[PDB]
Amino acid sequence: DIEMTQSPSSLSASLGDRVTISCSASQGISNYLNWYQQKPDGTVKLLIYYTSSLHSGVPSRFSGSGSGTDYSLTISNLEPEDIATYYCQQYSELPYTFGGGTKLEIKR
Amino acid sequence: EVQLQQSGAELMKPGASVKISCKATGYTFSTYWIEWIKQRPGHGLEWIGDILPGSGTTNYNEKFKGRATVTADRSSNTAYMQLSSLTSEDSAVYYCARWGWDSYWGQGTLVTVSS
Amino acid sequence: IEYPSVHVIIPTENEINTQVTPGEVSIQLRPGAEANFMLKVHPLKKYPVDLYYLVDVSASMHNNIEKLNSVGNDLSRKMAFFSRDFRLGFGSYVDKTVSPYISIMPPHGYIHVLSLTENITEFEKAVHRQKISGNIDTPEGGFDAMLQAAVCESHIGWRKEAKRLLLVMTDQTSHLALDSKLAGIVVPNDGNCHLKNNVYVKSTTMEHPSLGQLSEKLIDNNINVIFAVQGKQFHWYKDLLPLLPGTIAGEIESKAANLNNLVVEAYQKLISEVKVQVENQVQGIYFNITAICPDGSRKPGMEGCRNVTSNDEVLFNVTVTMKKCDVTGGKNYAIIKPIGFNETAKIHIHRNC
Amino acid sequence: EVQLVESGPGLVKPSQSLSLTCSVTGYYITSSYYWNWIRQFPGNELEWMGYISYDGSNSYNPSLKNRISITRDTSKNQFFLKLNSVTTEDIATYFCVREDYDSFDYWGQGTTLTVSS
Amino acid sequence: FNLDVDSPAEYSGPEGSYFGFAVDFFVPSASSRMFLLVGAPKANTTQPGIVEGGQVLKCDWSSTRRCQPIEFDATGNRDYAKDDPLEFKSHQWFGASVRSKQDKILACAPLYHWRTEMKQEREPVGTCFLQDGTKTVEYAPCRSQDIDADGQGFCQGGFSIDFTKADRVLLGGPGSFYWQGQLISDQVAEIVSKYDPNVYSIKYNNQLATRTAQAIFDDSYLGYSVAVGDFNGDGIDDFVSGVPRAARTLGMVYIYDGKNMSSLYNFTGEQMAAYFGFSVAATDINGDDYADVFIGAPLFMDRGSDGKLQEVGQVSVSLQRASGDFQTTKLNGFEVFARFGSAIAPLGDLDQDGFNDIAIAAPYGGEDKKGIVYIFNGRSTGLNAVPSQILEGQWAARSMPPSFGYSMKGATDIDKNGYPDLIVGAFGVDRAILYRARPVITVNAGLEVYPSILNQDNKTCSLPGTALKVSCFNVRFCLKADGKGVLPRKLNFQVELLLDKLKQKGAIRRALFLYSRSPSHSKNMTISRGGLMQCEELIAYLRDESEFRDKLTPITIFMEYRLDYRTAADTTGLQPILNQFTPANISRQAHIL
Amino acid sequence: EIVLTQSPAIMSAFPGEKVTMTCSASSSVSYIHWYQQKSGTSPKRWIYDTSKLASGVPARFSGSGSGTSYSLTISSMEAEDAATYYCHQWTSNPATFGGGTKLEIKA
Ligand SMILES: *[C@@H]1O[C@H](CO)[C@@H](O[C@@H]2O[C@H](CO)[C@@H](O[C@@H]3O[C@H](CO[C@H]4O[C@H](CO)[C@@H](O[C@H]5O[C@H](CO)[C@@H](O)[C@H](O)[C@@H]5O)[C@H](O)[C@@H]4O)[C@@H](O)[C@H](O[C@H]4O[C@H](CO)[C@@H](O)[C@H](O)[C@@H]4O)[C@@H]3O)[C@H](O)[C@H]2NC(C)=O)[C@H](O)[C@H]1NC(C)=O
Ligand SMILES: *[C@@H]1O[C@H](CO)[C@@H](O[C@@H]2O[C@H](CO)[C@@H](O[C@@H]3O[C@H](CO)[C@@H](O)[C@H](O)[C@@H]3O)[C@H](O)[C@H]2NC(C)=O)[C@H](O)[C@H]1NC(C)=O
Ligand SMILES: *[C@@H]1O[C@H](CO)[C@@H](O[C@@H]2O[C@H](CO)[C@@H](O)[C@H](O)[C@H]2NC(C)=O)[C@H](O)[C@H]1NC(C)=O
Ligand SMILES: *[C@@H]1O[C@H](CO)[C@@H](O[C@@H]2O[C@H](CO)[C@@H](O)[C@H](O)[C@H]2NC(C)=O)[C@H](O)[C@H]1NC(C)=O
Ligand SMILES: *[C@@H]1O[C@H](CO)[C@@H](O[C@@H]2O[C@H](CO)[C@@H](O)[C@H](O)[C@H]2NC(C)=O)[C@H](O)[C@H]1NC(C)=O
Ligand SMILES: *[C@@H]1O[C@H](CO)[C@@H](O[C@@H]2O[C@H](CO)[C@@H](O)[C@H](O)[C@H]2NC(C)=O)[C@H](O)[C@H]1NC(C)=O
Ligand SMILES: *[C@@H]1O[C@H](CO)[C@@H](O[C@@H]2O[C@H](CO)[C@@H](O)[C@H](O)[C@H]2NC(C)=O)[C@H](O)[C@H]1NC(C)=O
Ligand SMILES: *[C@@H]1O[C@H](CO)[C@@H](O[C@@H]2O[C@H](CO)[C@@H](O)[C@H](O)[C@H]2NC(C)=O)[C@H](O)[C@H]1NC(C)=O
Ligand SMILES: *[C@@H]1O[C@H](CO)[C@@H](O)[C@H](O)[C@H]1NC(C)=O
Ligand SMILES: *[C@@H]1O[C@H](CO)[C@@H](O)[C@H](O)[C@H]1NC(C)=O
């Protein structure tokens, strides 16, 4: 069927740096991708929907764009609340699906 | 404040079924599509189904179409996920949701199914 | 002092938190000079929406009539990311039922089926139950149906607080005003609501509405119209769009795979379109207007701005001069209204005669 | 053609009311044409009594003003001339004619109305 | 400009008949008198089994204002087979369109339905009736074996009609071929001569007609409106016809050759759904012997001062030139939703100014939207876009508005006065009114002061009120007048003169007439027969300098005149008027030495 | 209203002779009708629309006139032309008729 695959595995960057999360679909999507984020132990939050609609209560360091099968999330000036696991939830037609998740860390 | 209050965790044996729920308050229950998703132990997130509580229509993840159902009750105004004939791989934390797949979700409730 | 020089002073406190900012426009001026004030308009990111689905039912609609039933479901799901709330209504039409077309599904004029509701399966039932009909002439009765959708507020149940969107689905073009002479109908459309038990019983005696009439009514009660049609006839419609402000149109794909996205794309376009108009001016009063966009390239002419969004107040420059006294006395009317917004800029004109 | 007959005339007393009709056969004439009425005093010229059409109004040569009224029936192609207050100067031949155009023809076949002792 | 709108001839029909829907005049060569033709399409006739069949009534011009039905068809519906009606005349709208020529009258029922020979049907084939003296025939321009929607079955033949010079009839058939439409024309003699009372389809030999076209032209409605006139140089009038939704609803007007049905000219609108082609007309508006082309577009939306569109209506006016080409302007309406471009009718030279004028009307204009007819005068430069006279409906709406101006016809000198009169219909009130044209008088006026310079010390003439002599001057004025048509030889005029007009405005009056000892004087003029100016010599004098100190401002001598409108009027009260482009005063001045 | 008058009240006219029937108005009429009726029988009119033969009327009868002055010219007379002729006007509320003029037979 239509599935969403995330390209990153485990990403890392120093705090204050900029990273991106990106993913693609096995089939095209006429409308969108939602970007989600969760803590190792916490409730998943919606960051961005419809590629660029920034959820309220999310810093405007968070952005994004993309074509039907190729999307990305950009997070500038990373702080500890950004160092989290990100998900791509595709929306084309029912059933809806998620990618496997990509964890963001910092370097040692 | 607007809230979603999810039921607690439980332990079960294979073949078991569980009805889990997530209470709506501070908003009109009947107005939003309520999603159910789950997080698997090292497999990321999966969508499992949904319901429009203001109606009689539901959606399912094909994988569980013949196994799981989704319901709602306008009296108690809570969301319900119905899981049955379960095994160890069906053990995941399940979440309910608000408007447009809002940031308001359940907390994540796990039911362990094992020997 | 028999020289009430120019000023515009507004002491009025309107609903403070609305999307349109004037109290009232209060203008007391002598003939000889003008006055100036500013208005602002701001759409909100979750403003609720009401969609009324108006569809033809002719034989040629078979390919889409069987899809609308499912479209409403996928659509309520997509719309959930765009607005605070969402309701669906429904109605249908074929053509006038008079002897010049038919002998006197059996054809009908316009019938209202479902008021705007939350019950998605009621929508599905309303759509599912429409049997396929047809007529002889190629063009349909869509303009008559649009008018009734725009006037019969008491049958549709449109909210004031929600954007009012009229969705019109055809495969063909519509009949026009004056075509009706062939129908033996030479009596003008008065622009009012004429449904009895939700049926437009006057469709067989009234002339089809003109484009002018559809435009004025749709703007006045803020019903935006999104039109969709098969790609060939679409060219006629796209070329008509500049004629009636407050409208969007697009084509229906051969597999109609995006019907649940036609309104969505249009919705986004409507949110980003902020236009106003000066209307119903009194003979001794003369207004001019221009819009200021965030780009800085402010323009006269165009009604407003494009490529705008939330947290972006569109600014409108409004000015007025005065002529000799007309049928005078203080006069209350609306002067400026944003299209698709319920709030308007009310005006009170005054002068010393 | 236009076939005309008249109510049989009678002998009436001075100032006695009398109804005399114009019965027309051959085709429908109650709304298709304008009708008039003629008064013929033998030995002299024809005079005129009145008119009627689909429009039930009339006119009159104001001698016995408003003493004469004209009525139009429907299914019977029957017109009625009602004479009130007949005088001895009203002894004359009465009949109807058919035309709207300023002309007249299709006159009746003779009537003898007598007002006497 | 001279239309008499004070004492017009008003006619009416039965309530609900739509009397006034269509109008024309009937002026036979066979009679010295005139009758008006006014349609009543939903009239109740006496025909058996027929409801609201429709008729046309003849109304006498010379008072006696009654309208008599024309007996075009005294019968009911014919049968096809036992208990199976051939035709359906109820609600056919007979009289929806009426036209005449010389001694003949044509009128049609575009919504006449017919049963085909092959299949049970109720198709809007349409039908016409034509009379010549007492000979009455039915003419079926679109009744043939081509009995379906892709043929002539839905033609509505008779929807529109007109008569050419010589003696030919043009008929519009807008429903042919899925409403591509069709023009059909036939000789009058053929229509009558070949008539056979029991044949549904009659073939004619010189019939001209358009033919079925590609699907791209479907729903265009050719024949919706017609007009005639010669454009292709010489010969028989060509056929002008509107197609309301040609060119993807922009609308078009086509002109086809008078000898064979083949296009010569192609006109098109600018705006979709403005209905260019809704109505058409032709006449030599600029007086250069070339019929011009007038095209209505009744729901044209113009763009206002506010940058927005406004539905006001339009008439396109194209002038025919010697080169074979056209030049053009545009006349927009005056009020929103007042459909100005919906009705067009040549007036002809209404005011006898050498050029034909034209009436254009808005059936739903004015506060109290009774309908407005605008009269536009012709010039060598084309039509004057600025109206000279405005004619309005007089009756309140009952349901639909009177729609005064819906139907119109001019170019006909019904009265004795040789100026064409005008019929304007108002079907919403079951009425029609014939407005007469007043004769128009041209006046040659003169004014001269012979002592161009006044010597204030030249005290040589006596002042009648005293023993002293004064300086004075001879102020002569004259008037001559004439006109066309029927006007009396003797015309009374009121003439008034002023002295030192620019000072009498609250200042010293430096000159008075000698006899009246007043700045003013009046005279009863009785100018007559034409070519002769009647003159009158008044003597004015100067006031003494001791008080009348201004010796620099010229003394203005002013004369003005007005026609006695009543002692100029004929038997019927058709008062003559003065021409709208003729001034009625003269300014002269004298200087002080 | 006015009454039409006539001058040839009685004439001993003969077949073969030219004869005119006339009328005169006190105000403009601009119209005349010539009606025919024998005292003992049922014939129809001669002339309508000022000058136009009524159905069945021979060429001998030719109408004329305008304004206030009207006539009917009978060309060389027929054996049955010795009849009573009437003028008629319906241009006002009453109908107006001529007094009647007649031709007779005596030999
Ligand atoms: C004002 O504007 C109007 C409108 O644009 C002009 O009027 C148009 O003028 C055209 C040119 O004369 C007319 O079309 C012509 O029609 C004749 C005969 O038509 C019949 O035969 C056709 C087939 O031979 C048939 O059509 C069938 O075949 C088509 C092929 O694609 C199919 O599409 C169609 O569905 C049918 O299957 C018709 O239905 C008729 O039966 C043709 O012979 C002409 O052909 C010309 O062009 C072709 C192009 O490739 C060429 O080979 C030929 O040799 C020849 O040149 C042409 O089609 C048109 O109908 C007519 N429109 C109307 C409404 O009448 C008008 O002239 C203009 N006036 C002025 C003053 O400028
Ligand atoms: C024009 O449209 C605006 C759209 O914002 C309409 O006003 C809005 O109406 C909704 C109705 O539910 C209001 O929501 C509720 O308002 C109450 C008010 O105290 C609040 O307590 C609730 O929590 C909730 O917010 C919304 O606030 C309101 N917005 C504004 C600006 O008033 C408006 O009524 C329409 N009509 C006019 C004339 O403005
Ligand atoms: C939306 O409409 C549907 C369709 O009628 C309603 O569902 C059914 O309504 C009938 C009406 O008597 C009941 O008998 C059925 O039992 C209803 N279905 C179910 C599953 O109960 C539906 O209830 C309406 N939605 C709302 C919110 O009222
Ligand atoms: C909106 O319009 C007003 C006038 O209608 C503009 O005000 C003028 O600004 C210029 C700038 O120097 C002044 O010289 C004029 O005197 C002002 N007019 C008046 C009546 O005072 C105003 O600037 C316009 N708004 C924008 C955004 O440019
Ligand atoms: C012509 O006569 C018919 C007579 O029936 C009139 O038609 C009737 O009008 C009444 C009006 O309310 C209807 O309720 C009847 O059913 C009508 N009958 C039919 C057969 O339609 C008609 O109105 C008259 N038309 C005119 C112009 O007078
Ligand atoms: C209709 O009549 C016109 C009359 O002129 C014909 O037009 C001429 O046809 C000849 C034929 O060779 C051309 O050489 C001329 O140039 C044409 N004149 C014009 C003005 O075009 C026309 O052909 C006739 N049409 C039909 C179908 O018979
Ligand atoms: C509305 O006002 C604007 C300006 O406030 C007018 O347009 C400008 O007028 C000035 C006057 O000197 C010109 O120099 C500018 O070139 C004009 N702008 C443009 C784009 O041409 C505008 O015309 C007014 N509108 C009306 C209907 O009066
Ligand atoms: C003398 O005649 C002139 C015009 O011939 C009058 O002045 C005005 O002329 C314009 C020209 O179109 C008209 O529209 C005005 O209506 C005229 N004024 C009037 C009062 O009619 C001039 O006023 C005349 N002089 C007098 C004393 O009447
Ligand atoms: C705004 O402008 C950008 C410029 O590239 C364009 O891509 C975008 O679609 C525009 N948005 C709207 C609503 O027109
Ligand atoms: C002309 O004569 C009439 C006759 O009554 C008179 O009323 C009018 O005032 C006279 N006009 C002049 C200018 O003498």
Rounded Cα gap, residues E118 and B52, in angstroms:
58
Asked if the Cβ–Cβ distance from C120 to B32 is below 8 Å, we say no
Using a CB-CB distance cutoff of 8 angstroms, which residues of chain F are in contact with residue D44?
99-100
Q: Give the distance from residue E136's alpha carbon to the nearest chain D alpha carbon, in angstroms.
A: 17
User: Cis peptide leading into E197, omega within 30 of 0?
Assistant: no
Picking from C215, C319, C20, the residue whose alpha carbon sits closest to that of residue E308 is: C215
Indicate the residue of C77, C81, C258 with minimum beta-carbon distance to A30.
Answer: C258
Picking from E285, E234, E233, E226, the residue whose alpha carbon sits closest to that of residue E255 is: E226
How many structural domains are present in chain D? 1
What's at E209, amino acid-wise? A
E91 C-alpha to ligand 5 centroid (Å): 11
- Residue E246 maps to a domain: no
What's the token pair of residue E170?
């043009």
Using a CB-CB distance cutoff of 8 angstroms, which residues of chain D are in contact with residue F48?
101, 103
CATH architecture of residue range(s) C25-43+275-350: Sandwich (2.60)
Rounded Cα gap, residues F50 and F31, in angstroms:
6
Nearest listed ligand to the Cα of residue C8: 4
D-E contacts at Cβ under 8 angstroms: 20
Given CB atoms, is C74 within the 8 Å cutoff of chain A? yes
Q: Give the distance from residue C46's alpha carbon to the nearest chain A alpha carbon, in angstroms.
A: 12
What's at E578, amino acid-wise? L
Rounded Cα gap, residues E404 and C46, in angstroms:
52
Rounded Cα gap, residues E461 and E559, in angstroms:
23
The CATH number assigned to the domain holding B32 equals 2.60.40.10
Rounded Cα gap, residues B71 and E522, in angstroms:
104
Task: Please state whether at least 3 CB pairs lie below 8 Å between chains C and A.
Answer: yes
Q: Which domain holds residue E219?
A: 30-223
How many structural domains are present in chain B? 1
Indicate if E173 and E282 belong to the same structural domain. Answer: no
E380 CB under 6 A from ligand 10? no
What's the token pair of residue E449?
């002061």
E262 CB under 6 A from ligand 1? no
Using a CB-CB distance cutoff of 8 angstroms, which residues of chain C are in contact with residue A50?
81
End-to-end Cα distance, chain A = 40
Going through E403-471 in order, the beta strands assigned E by DSSP cover: 408-412, 421-426, 431-435, 440-449, 453-454, 461-462, 469-470
Given CB atoms, is D27 within the 8 Å cutoff of chain E? yes
- Residue E417 maps to a domain: yes
What's the token pair of residue A44?
């998943």
B90: helix, coil or strand?
A: helix
Alpha-carbon separation of residue E273 from C251, E180, E251, E311, E403 (angstroms): 21, 17, 8, 11, 21
Other chains touching D, judged by 3 or more CB pairs under 8 Å? E, F
Stated as kind and residue range, the H or E segment containing C215 is helix C211-220
What's the token pair of residue E564?
């006695």
- Residue D91 maps to a domain: yes
Stated as kind and residue range, the H or E segment containing E513 is strand E511-513
Indicate if E192 and E319 belong to the same structural domain. Answer: no
Q: Give the distance from residue F91's alpha carbon to the nearest chain E alpha carbon, in angstroms.
A: 6
For chain F, state the CA radius of gyration: 13
Answer whether C345's CB lies under 8 Å from C19's CB. no
Answer whether E142's CB lies under 8 Å from E176's CB. yes
Picking from E140, A43, A54, E298, the residue whose alpha carbon sits closest to that of residue B45 is: A43
Rounded Cα gap, residues E106 and E169, in angstroms:
9
Rounded Cα gap, residues E403 and E389, in angstroms:
18
Rounded Cα gap, residues B107 and E69, in angstroms:
89
Using a CB-CB distance cutoff of 8 angstroms, which residues of chain C are in contact with residue A31?
78, 261, 264
Q: Torsions phi, psi of E182, nearest 5?
A: -160, 140
What's the token pair of residue C306?
């494009």
Tell me, rounded to whole angstroms, the distance of Cα E551 from its chain centroid.
55
Given CB atoms, is E571 within the 8 Å cutoff of chain F? yes
Which phi-psi region, left, alpha or beta, contains residue E175 (left: φ > 0; alpha: ψ -120 to 50)? alpha
Domain ranges of chain C: 25-43+275-350, 49-271
Fold of C49-271: Rossmann fold (3.40.50)
Picking from B77, B114, B111, the residue whose alpha carbon sits closest to that of residue B94 is: B111
What's the token pair of residue A107?
């370097």
Rounded Cα gap, residues E140 and E87, in angstroms:
13
- Residue D116 maps to a domain: no
E262 CB under 6 A from ligand 6? yes
Picking from E506, E489, E451, the residue whose alpha carbon sits closest to that of residue E473 is: E451
Answer whether C228's CB lies under 8 Å from C173's CB. no
What's at E305, amino acid-wise? S
Q: Which of E490, E494, E518, E536 to mutate to test the pocket of ligand 10 (most atoms within 8 A of CB)?
A: E494
Q: Give the distance from residue C119's alpha carbon to the nearest chain B alpha carbon, in angstroms.
A: 6
End-to-end Cα distance, chain D = 40
Stated as kind and residue range, the H or E segment containing C240 is helix C231-240
In order of start, what are the domains of chain A with their CATH numbers? Answer: 4-102 (2.60.40.10)
What's the token pair of residue E4?
């008499």
The alpha-helical segments, DSSP class H, found in C43-174 are 62-79, 120-128, 142-151, 153-156
Asked if the Cβ–Cβ distance from B59 to A95 is below 8 Å, we say yes
Angle between helices C142-151 and C211-220 in degrees, nearest 10: 30
Given CB atoms, is E122 within the 8 Å cutoff of chain D? no
- Return the number of other C-beta atoms located less than 10 Å from residue E527's C-beta: 26
What are the residues facing E109 on neighbouring strands? Answer: E127
Answer whether C260's CB lies under 8 Å from C78's CB. yes
- Residue D76 maps to a domain: yes
The CATH number assigned to the domain holding E387 equals 2.130.10.130
What's the token pair of residue E436?
């007469």
Answer whether E12's CB lies under 8 Å from E36's CB. no
- Residue D64 maps to a domain: yes
Does the annotation place E254 within a ligand binding site? no
Rounded Cα gap, residues C228 and E98, in angstroms:
43
Answer whether E539's CB lies under 8 Å from E475's CB. yes
Which phi-psi region, left, alpha or beta, contains residue F50 (left: φ > 0; alpha: ψ -120 to 50)? left
Answer whether A21's CB lies under 8 Å from A6's CB. yes
Alpha-carbon separation of residue C302 from C40, C245, C277, C280, D67 (angstroms): 16, 11, 10, 19, 76
SS3 of chain D: the string is CCEEEECCCCEECCCCCEEEEEEEECCCCCCCCCEEEEEECCCCCEEEEEEECCCCCCCCCCCCCCCEEEEECCCCCEEEEEECCCCCCCCEEEEEEECCCCCCCCCCCCCCEEECC
- Residue E585 maps to a domain: yes
Interface test with D, best of F5, F23, F30, F35 (most D CBs within 10 A): F35
Q: Which domain holds residue B28?
A: 3-99
Q: Give the position of tokens 């113009």.
A: E302
Per CB distance under 8 Å, which residues of F are interface residues toward D?
A: 31, 33, 35, 37, 39, 42, 44-45, 48-49, 54, 86, 88-91, 93-95, 97-100
Picking from C234, C132, C137, the residue whose alpha carbon sits closest to that of residue C180 is: C137
Stated as kind and residue range, the H or E segment containing E179 is helix E176-179
Indicate the residue of D42, D45, D101 with minimum beta-carbon distance to F98.
Answer: D45
Stated as kind and residue range, the H or E segment containing E209 is strand E208-209
Rounded Cα gap, residues C185 and C176, in angstroms:
12
Task: Please state whether at least 3 CB pairs lie below 8 Å between chains B and D.
Answer: no
- Residue B114 maps to a domain: no
Q: Torsions phi, psi of F46, nearest 5?
A: -95, -60
Q: Which domain holds residue D30?
A: 3-108
Picking from E103, E58, E94, the residue whose alpha carbon sits closest to that of residue E75 is: E94
User: Please, which residues have CB within 8 angstroms of residue C329's CB and are 6 or more apart in sequence?
Assistant: none
CATH architecture of residue range(s) F10-103: Sandwich (2.60)
Domain ranges of chain F: 10-103
